[PDB]
Structures are given as structure tokens and as C-alpha cells.
Structure 1
Amino acid sequence: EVQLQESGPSLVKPSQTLSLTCSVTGDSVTSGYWSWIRQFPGNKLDYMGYISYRGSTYYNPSLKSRISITRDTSKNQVYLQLKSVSSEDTATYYCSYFDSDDYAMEYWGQGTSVTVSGGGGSGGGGSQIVLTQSPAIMSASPGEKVTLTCSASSSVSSSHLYWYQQKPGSSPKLWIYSTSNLASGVPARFSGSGSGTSYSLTISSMEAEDAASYFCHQWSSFPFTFGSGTKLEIKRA
């Protein structure tokens, strides 16, 4: 009921100002937030910030000085602006929409990759909860019961702990909301559980289509964060 697409340069030179556009299409909305989230090579996800239905903005302290997210209702678009880019800003950028009143769904765009002309070598200050996913890579044969864990460095509200599945050439899809609730499109063979600083995702019976990457997410404390991630594979060469 809502679709998003990112557009902008695929390569930028240092010091230049990276600019991206998020074209939103679908039903109108009476609330919510539009976030920008980027993914670096290695697939680590970084929450950049958002702009709400009412224009309120929030930036990850780590980008504070260089970022700005603006909206343009008339043409149903939201923007990303990032100054003083460096090789550390190279990553595929995604925009996403979420309605606080509907914890169960999230919309992500295709994600346009952006690079910075090789090289690159500033005033935030903040704290954040670290999410650790071990093991990093895993193989299981079809039929095995699989369990993935997410360890938080500090307690988080279990209702704000989410899981995501992602496959090559595609963006993250909401898999589990509020520790143990499956999202739309998820086979019931999946389940989640946990509390405090300990959570886990479980697959009762491993299917070939479950091979992909899984990331846990925390939005109990600002800035929201994502886990290192677990890449799951199927055995048999």
C-alpha cells in the first residue's frame, strides 16, 4: 500500500555533498516516520535518522553535523543530504516507512548504491546499544531445527526488538516484530523469543528458501541499531 524508490548518483568525490531522493507512492498516511538507513560492504546496517509526519527530525549523533532530512509533501518525496563524504560513506542507501500505530509492518525501498572516489581519511557524541549476532555464518541441512541469537549490550524493551531477512540483490524485509510476532509473509515455522538483553529467532524445520541473512534490530533506545548479522546457508555442494 506504499512503495518507495531511491534515486541519485552512484559515485561521488570526497568533500562533495551526497544527495538522494526517495520517491514515495501509494495510499496517503495520517502519521508515521520516513527513515534513511544505509548498508556498507560487509552488510552492516546503519540507522541515519528520520523525518516524521509532522516534520520532526532525528539524526544519528554520529552524522549530526553532516546530515539533513527534508520532506516535500506536494510532490510526495523525502530527501537525504550528506556533506563531506569519504570512502566511509560508500554504501547502498535505503529509505523506509513505519507507522508507530502498526508495529507489524515496515516498508523499504530498492536501495540505490552510492560510492565515493577512493581515498578519504565530526561532532556528535552519544551512546548506543550494541547488538551482537553469533555465529556470523552458519550452515544447516534441510530439516534441522535452527536457532539464531541476538545479544544486546544493555537491556531493551522486548516489544522493540525486531528481526529482518535479506537476500542478495534485495532489501531487508521485516521478519519478526516485538520479540515473537511474525510479520506478514513469514512461514509459521519461524518463531522468536527473549527478554532483557537476550533474544533468539528459531526455524523449526530448515527449508532451502530460508538460506539468507538475518539481522536483529533495536529501537527501544536512540539511536536505533542493528546487529552484526548472521548469514545462513544450506549444506550440500
Structure 2
Amino acid sequence: QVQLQESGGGLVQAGGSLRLSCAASGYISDAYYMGWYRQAPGKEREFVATITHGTNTYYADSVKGRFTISRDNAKNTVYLQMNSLKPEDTAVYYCAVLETRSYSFRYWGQGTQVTVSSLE
């Protein structure tokens, strides 16, 4: 039903910063989760961060202390601020919504590529 659209991917230096955003085309309950996942070369997709109730967050340990998730409730948009970027953060980043009526359905965006370069 609702369409999720990521923006902000690109090519960034190791140690750099990048901010992704994901806007939904319809109303998302403040009590649903909006989150980020990523899929790196040769690996399965993995959880990155999620947020609900405006400010209640959870991060994968691989990114905790480097990435920040935030959310604008009115605008149905979630954001992923990346700092201290590492080459191992290179991946396609996908935003997702998890409904909390029954925790049974997840909705996915189309993905945005983030490439962290080790070349100086």
C-alpha cells in the first residue's frame, strides 16, 4: 500500500559522514517502527537501527556509537545519520516499517547504495 522512498546514498570517504532519509507516502502510526537494514557484498541483509514513539531507538552493536536514527512523526520520515564511516559499512541501505498491531508485516523501501571508499 504505502510507498517508502529512500534518498541520500552515495560515495563517501572512510571516516566521513552521510545522512539518509526515507519518506512514506502515507500516514505511519507513531507507535509503528521505522528502521534501517543493509545488505553488504557477500553477506545477508542485516538490521542497522530502528525507532518508534519519536525517540525510542535501538542500534545494532556494529553501528552503535557511530550512527544516529531520528524520525519526524508529522512527516512520516525516518533519518539515518552516519558518522565515523568504515569500509565495512558499504552496502545497500533499506528503510522498513514494522506494524505493531500484530508485528507480522514489514514494508520495505527500494534501497539506496552507500559506498565507503578507502582510497585517499
Taking structure 1 as the reference length, what is the TM-score of the superposition? 0.47
- Quick one: structure 1 residues 14 and 25, their matched pair in 2 at CA, closer, same or farther if it must change by over 3 Å? same
Q: Per-residue deviation at 1:62?
A: 2.2
Q: Per-residue deviation at 1:54?
A: 4.0
Moved over 6 A (4+): none
* Partner in structure 2 of residue 16 of structure 1: 16
Q: Per-residue deviation at 1:119?
A: 4.7
CA distance in structure 2 between the partners assigned to 1:66 and 1:90 by the alignment: 14
* Partner in structure 2 of residue 57 of structure 1: 57
Equivalenced residue count is 120
**35-44 vs 21-30, greater mean Cα deviation:** 21-30
Question: Is 1:100 paired with 2:109?
Answer: no
Q: Per-residue deviation at 1:117?
A: 1.8
Report the 3-state secondary structure (helix = DSSP H, G, I; strand = E; otherwise coil) of the residue aligned with 1:42: coil
Mind listing any 5+ residue stretches in structure 1 that lack a counterpart?
121-237
Paired letter, 1:82 = M
CA distance in structure 1 between the partners assigned to 2:109 and 2:82 by the alignment: 19
**98-107 vs 87-96, greater mean Cα deviation:** 98-107
- Quick one: structure 1 residues 6 and 18, their matched pair in 2 at CA, closer, same or farther if it must change by over 3 Å? same
Larger Rg: 1
Paired letter, 1:37 = Y
Identity of matched residues, %: 45
Per-residue CA distance 1:62-112 (angstroms, 9 max, x = gap): 211101100122332110011111211110001100112223311000000
